[PDB]
Write a protein that binds this ligand. Structure first.
Ligand SMILES: O=C(Nc1cc2nc(N3CCOCC3)oc2cc1N1CCCCC1)c1cccc(-c2cnc3[nH]ccc3c2)n1
Length: 288
């Protein structure tokens, strides 16, 4: 199944887990839930190595869950686990490297990368929906769908990542509220666990893709991106006022169609949101 690595190997291949950012000579590519993701080089392959870093038993459960989800769920719109390490007191997960990093970072053009075209943004939206559909068809709920979690390969194929908190499946509740508040549905923020909450967060991701803005920005008004939906519905603004200006191939018709998907995902009432299959078909129609 997955390759078993010993910690020593992964130390050696990451400049001993050099935590400086890759841009300044280290191996750190970013930080990712409850761990740091390092670049490694092993037997002709660049790999991503997440070393997990709030108790030990809970961290270990998240590690075991990541492994179980990935063993059951292989799909081109999900991240691929190559292996792991559990010997000693560290836990590592080793994945196929995604050379274009996160959607978040490509939206902000971090490190000077060129802006994504509308045509590419449409493919990424479709791919990400196809990943989430796969997960929901397999009765998993992700719980932290966001742009920082949609990775992008050499061809800008979208891959969903981070399954440490994912859950199997009738809407249950929890005491341990998890996710990222800027993306989270009202009912997730109160502790329900439902696939309908992934739909909502995807909504926010769709806004990010349209606008190029982050989901939250403390120095902006509104500080939360999901607030623009209300500005647009209460006639104060149009989707055209917010469309990312860093593209020249966006047409009104497809942009309005993606915004219409996003609006529907973002319904306050969970039972009025489309399910992922519907999102997927709408996103396919936007492009046809
Ligand atoms: O290759 C991976 N991540 C990655 C690659 C990056 N590459 C780049 N660049 C190369 C070209 O130009 C700009 C900088 O930046 C990258 C950032 C990442 N991630 C992005 C999410 C945070 C972890 C590191 C990768 C592959 C498979 C799984 C994961 C992964 C696994 N678990 C995760 N939990 C939260 C995030 C997360 C990410 N990450």
């Amino acid at each position: 199944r997955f390759h078993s690595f010993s910690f020593y190997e992964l130390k050696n291949v990451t400049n001993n887990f050099d935590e400086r950012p890759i841009s300044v000579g280290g191996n750190k590519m970013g930080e990712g839930g409850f761990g740091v993701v390092y670049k490694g080089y092993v037997n002709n392959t660049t790999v991503a190595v997440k070393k997990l870093a709030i108790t030990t038993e809970e961290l270990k459960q998240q590690f075991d869950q990541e492994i179980k989800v990935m063993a059951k769920c292989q799909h081109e719109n999900l991240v691929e686990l190559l292996g792991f390490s559990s010997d000693g007191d560290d836990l590592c997960l080793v994945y196929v490297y995604m050379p274009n990093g996160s959607l978040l970072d490509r939206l902000s053009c971090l490190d000077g990368t060129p802006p994504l075209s509308w045509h590419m943004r449409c493919k990424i939206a479709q791919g990400a929906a196809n990943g989430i559909n796969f997960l929901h068809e397999n009765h998993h709920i992700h719980r932290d769908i966001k742009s920082a979690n949609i990775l992008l390969d050499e061809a800008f194929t979208a891959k969903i990542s981070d399954f440490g908190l994912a859950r199997a499946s009738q809407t249950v509740m929890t005491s341990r509220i998890v996710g990222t508040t800027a993306y989270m549905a009202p009912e997730a923020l109160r502790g329900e666990i439902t696939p309908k909450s992934d739909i909502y967060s995807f909504g926010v991701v769709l806004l990010e893709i349209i606008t190029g803005l982050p989901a939250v920005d403390e120095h902006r008004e509104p500080q939360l991106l999901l607030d623009i939906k209300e500005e647009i519905e209460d006639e104060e603004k149009t989707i055209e006022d917010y469309i990312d200006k860093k593209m020249n191939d966006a047409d009104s018709t497809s942009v309005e169609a993606m915004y219409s998907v996003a609006s529907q995902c973002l319904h306050e009432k969970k039972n009025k949101r489309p399910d992922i299959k519907k999102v997927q078909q709408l996103l396919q129609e936007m492009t046809a």
